[model samples]
Target: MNIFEMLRIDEGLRLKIYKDTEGYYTIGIGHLLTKSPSLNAAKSELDKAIGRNCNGVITKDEAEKLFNQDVDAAVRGILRNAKLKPVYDSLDAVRRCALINMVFQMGETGVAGFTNSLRMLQQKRWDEAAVNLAKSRWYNQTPNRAKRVITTFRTGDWDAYKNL
Candidate 1:
């Protein structure tokens, strides 16, 4: 799948300012604020992160490009965790994308903590797998998002609601 599609499944199509998982002011797909060493410099860290040195929003095109770069990097980083190799190779593309999306949100270590869900996924027990995903604190915190991802696990499809 294209990087944009893969990223959009999780990030949604945001063309404006928003708060992210960490409650930091973010924009576009998922660009977090990168603090600049010098406040007196031409741009602040958040400015650099959003690629606008002032109060401005990213264009849809720019956001798409950012998603490609960000999601691609995240995918590569998650795949580097050799512990996920076997399951990574076994899932369908949609399910694989879902897992990588989870990694993107939670990091390899965070996603790896879902041992029961991961085991159920590897065993191809769809119901239990989705249940395990739904029972997490992550789910409790973000039920809408969690439901979307659980749907992916249950149906092996990428039909997460897109609203950023």
Candidate 2:
């Protein structure tokens, strides 16, 4: 199944748009709204926490300082569940971020389970990127969401979804 099949973002699906103070707009990524923190902020914070927590080296003092901004657990949990590594050996930033977003939104195991898709993406094969995106359990699950993201990856226009 593809992203469409996973998200079920077909015609007639209702889309919920959210706007932030900065005037940027974001759509829903699963049950969570992509509002607040700005997409860049969200991704950056997530990456920091993932790296730190996975190593389990954030001291109590750091945790105290980081308490209020503790979104890493949520992000890392999703990534862990999606079965995705922060780096895929040598994936470029774009592909890496795309995969991270997908895994973050869809569960690590869910995205990682796509063996063919991950391999193709690692190889930088665009057509395979399309195919890898198409055959996923994520399609049809959230309707337009899956399709929108898949299109983003397929076209290498990741920012469309990243900042959507």
Candidate 3:
């Protein structure tokens, strides 16, 4: 129904530290601990989320704060992107949510790299945009999530996403 719910399901909540598919340290809702400002800073927040000094399980209550911040950053990142902002503003709520989901997972720069896809999306050429997204490394890397994204892009249907 919203980007938050979609992301919660796609990213999945993890109360414990875990390695991502690419072996990066991650926690909470797909939060990349490895990319923190600093190891000490990371540990500091980790402790806050876990309610302890050492590495420990993150509680949902604390983790929601981190997830909210991540969502804020993701939205701002997209809006600040010169290439994406204009087109992003033209999209309907559902389409924008899909774009936000993409940016949340891949970062603004990563989404910006899809020049043709963005172009197609801007033109509202749904099928072409879907094709551009489907034929990419991102799709190959996370096919299941990418499939849903592609379908949503093609149909602009928020209900298209049912499972992760």
> Which candidate comes out best when scored by TM-score?
3
Cα misplacement distance, residue 46 of candidate 1 (Å): 3.7
Tens digit of lDDT per residue, candidate 1, span 40-114?
A: 331354466556655545678777776777777767776687667667787987888778777767778888888
lDDT of 3 by residue, 7-54 (tens): 888889887777676666678898877664455556676776556775
Instruction: Give the whole-model CA lDDT for all candidates, comma-separated.
Output: 0.70, 0.48, 0.83
Q: Give the total clashing residue pairs for model 3.
A: 0
Root-mean-square deviation of each candidate, in angstroms? Answer: 4.0, 13.1, 2.8
Ranking by lDDT: 3, 1, 2
TM-score, candidate 1, is 0.77
What's the C-alpha lDDT at position 130 in model 2?
A: 74
After superposing candidate 2 on the true structure, give the runs of residues whose Cα lies further than 4 Å from its correct spot.
1-71, 74-83, 86-89, 162-164
Give one digit per residue, the lDDT tens place, for model 2 in 23-50.
4332232223334556555444433643
Residue pairs with backbone atoms closer than 3 Å in model 1 (clashes): none
Give candidate 1 regions above 4 Å deviation.
1-3, 15-17, 34-43, 50-56, 158-164
